[PDB]
Enzyme design. Structure first.
Site, short mmCIF file in Angstrom:
data_model
loop_
_atom_site.label_atom_id
_atom_site.label_comp_id
_atom_site.label_asym_id
_atom_site.label_seq_id
_atom_site.Cartn_x
_atom_site.Cartn_y
_atom_site.Cartn_z
N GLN A 9 0.82 -1.21 0.00
CA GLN A 9 0.00 0.00 0.00
C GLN A 9 0.86 1.27 0.00
O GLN A 9 2.01 1.25 0.44
CB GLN A 9 -0.95 0.00 1.21
CG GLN A 9 -0.27 -0.08 2.57
CD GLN A 9 -1.25 -0.35 3.70
OE1 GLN A 9 -2.45 -0.10 3.57
NE2 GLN A 9 -0.74 -0.87 4.81
N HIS A 34 0.89 -4.53 3.09
CA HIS A 34 -0.45 -4.54 3.65
C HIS A 34 -0.62 -5.99 4.10
O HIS A 34 -0.94 -6.26 5.26
CB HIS A 34 -1.52 -4.19 2.61
CG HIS A 34 -2.92 -4.24 3.14
ND1 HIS A 34 -3.98 -3.65 2.49
CD2 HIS A 34 -3.42 -4.79 4.27
CE1 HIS A 34 -5.08 -3.85 3.19
NE2 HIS A 34 -4.77 -4.54 4.28
N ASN A 71 1.81 -0.45 10.79
CA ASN A 71 0.37 -0.21 10.76
C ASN A 71 0.33 1.27 10.34
O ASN A 71 0.91 2.12 11.01
CB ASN A 71 -0.23 -0.38 12.17
CG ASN A 71 -1.74 -0.31 12.18
OD1 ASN A 71 -2.36 0.25 11.27
ND2 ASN A 71 -2.36 -0.87 13.22
N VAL A 72 -0.31 1.58 9.22
CA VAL A 72 -0.33 2.97 8.77
C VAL A 72 -1.51 3.77 9.28
O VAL A 72 -1.49 5.00 9.26
CB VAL A 72 -0.31 3.06 7.22
CG1 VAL A 72 0.91 2.33 6.66
CG2 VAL A 72 -1.59 2.49 6.65
N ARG A 74 -2.93 3.16 12.48
CA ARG A 74 -2.77 3.31 13.93
C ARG A 74 -1.35 2.94 14.34
O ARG A 74 -0.68 2.17 13.65
CB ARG A 74 -3.78 2.41 14.66
CG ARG A 74 -5.21 2.62 14.21
CD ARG A 74 -6.12 1.55 14.78
NE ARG A 74 -5.88 1.34 16.20
CZ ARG A 74 -6.46 0.39 16.93
NH1 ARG A 74 -7.32 -0.45 16.36
NH2 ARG A 74 -6.18 0.27 18.22
N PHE A 80 -1.54 -5.23 14.07
CA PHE A 80 -1.75 -5.32 12.63
C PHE A 80 -1.25 -6.68 12.13
O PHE A 80 -1.92 -7.35 11.35
CB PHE A 80 -0.98 -4.20 11.93
CG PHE A 80 -1.25 -4.10 10.46
CD1 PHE A 80 -2.50 -4.41 9.94
CD2 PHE A 80 -0.26 -3.67 9.59
CE1 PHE A 80 -2.76 -4.29 8.58
CE2 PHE A 80 -0.51 -3.55 8.22
CZ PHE A 80 -1.76 -3.86 7.72
N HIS A 83 -3.61 -9.36 13.31
CA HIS A 83 -4.84 -9.35 12.52
C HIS A 83 -4.63 -10.01 11.16
O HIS A 83 -5.47 -10.78 10.70
CB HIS A 83 -5.32 -7.90 12.33
CG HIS A 83 -6.56 -7.78 11.50
ND1 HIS A 83 -6.53 -7.36 10.18
CD2 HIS A 83 -7.86 -8.04 11.78
CE1 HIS A 83 -7.76 -7.37 9.69
NE2 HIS A 83 -8.58 -7.78 10.64
N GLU A 84 -3.52 -9.70 10.50
CA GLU A 84 -3.23 -10.26 9.18
C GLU A 84 -2.98 -11.76 9.24
O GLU A 84 -3.37 -12.49 8.33
CB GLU A 84 -2.02 -9.56 8.56
CG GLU A 84 -2.32 -8.17 8.01
CD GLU A 84 -3.47 -8.16 7.01
OE1 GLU A 84 -3.41 -8.93 6.03
OE2 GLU A 84 -4.43 -7.39 7.20
N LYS A 87 -6.49 -13.53 9.98
CA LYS A 87 -7.43 -13.38 8.88
C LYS A 87 -6.96 -14.00 7.57
O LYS A 87 -7.78 -14.51 6.81
CB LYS A 87 -7.73 -11.90 8.67
CG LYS A 87 -8.74 -11.62 7.57
CD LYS A 87 -9.11 -10.14 7.53
CE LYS A 87 -10.11 -9.84 6.42
NZ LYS A 87 -9.87 -8.51 5.77
N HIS A 88 -5.66 -13.95 7.30
CA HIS A 88 -5.12 -14.48 6.05
C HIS A 88 -4.07 -15.57 6.20
O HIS A 88 -4.14 -16.61 5.53
CB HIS A 88 -4.51 -13.35 5.22
CG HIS A 88 -5.49 -12.29 4.82
ND1 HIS A 88 -6.34 -12.43 3.75
CD2 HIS A 88 -5.76 -11.07 5.35
CE1 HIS A 88 -7.08 -11.35 3.63
NE2 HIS A 88 -6.75 -10.51 4.59
#
Length: 190
Positions: A9, A34, A71-72, A74, A80, A83-84, A87-88
């Site tokens: 990103q 990202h 983390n762009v 926050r 971050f 979370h990644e 989720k992925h």
């Protein structure tokens, strides 16, 4: 999964859509990671059951991760990454454990210098209009395959901005392949 989407990103563009509050990405001038999203049948696999995020497994990569995967939105990088992964990352755990997954992303980033590929052809960022065909062509010239371009439209001015660039990889996580989906129109600001 049958392939990977390595998504980078452009921090300033991403933060430009946050018209309220702080956004740490506002000051970054390089493409950052990202995520690395496993794919299957032209769709992102998400929230697969797997191992919970464990920071000690990627302790040796903290310097690279803080620099390349910040983390762009926050100021909490670890959240971050967590979370990644959940989720992925869990969706490719059958062959890439947590440590190898993050190492893959870091290696991919170090081998896919977007601005470096564009700068010599006068296609670097300057807040002006760019052609989707031109940008994709320059990246294909340097890397060998077509990238995926993602854009977002300002709700106030209706102008489209490039926010992410996707590099597509085969399931081996090293062989680059053509991307087939863009969310950008013929022109956008970069």
């Amino acid at each position: 999964f049958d392939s990977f989407w390595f998504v980078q990103q452009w921090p300033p563009a991403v933060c430009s859509f946050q018209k309220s509050g702080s956004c740490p990405g506002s000051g970054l001038r390089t493409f950052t990671i990202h995520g690395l999203w496993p794919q299957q049948s032209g769709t992102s696999l998400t929230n697969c059951p797997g191992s919970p995020f464990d920071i000690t497994k990627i302790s040796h990569l903290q310097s690279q991760l803080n620099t390349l995967w910040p983390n762009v939105l926050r100021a909490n990088n670890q959240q971050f990454w967590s979370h990644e992964w959940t989720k992925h990352g869990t969706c490719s755990e059958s062959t890439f454990n947590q440590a190898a997954y993050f190492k893959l992303a870091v290696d991919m980033r170090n081998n896919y210098d977007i601005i470096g590929a564009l700068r010599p052809h006068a296609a670097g960022p300057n807040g002006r209009t760019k052609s989707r065909q031109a940008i994709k062509g320059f990246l294909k010239a340097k890397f060998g395959k077509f990238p995926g371009l993602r854009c977002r439209t300002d709700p106030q001015t209706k102008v489209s901005y490039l926010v992410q660039v996707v590099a597509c990889f085969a399931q081996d996580g090293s062989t680059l392949i053509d991307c087939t989906r863009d969310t950008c129109g013929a022109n956008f600001i970069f």
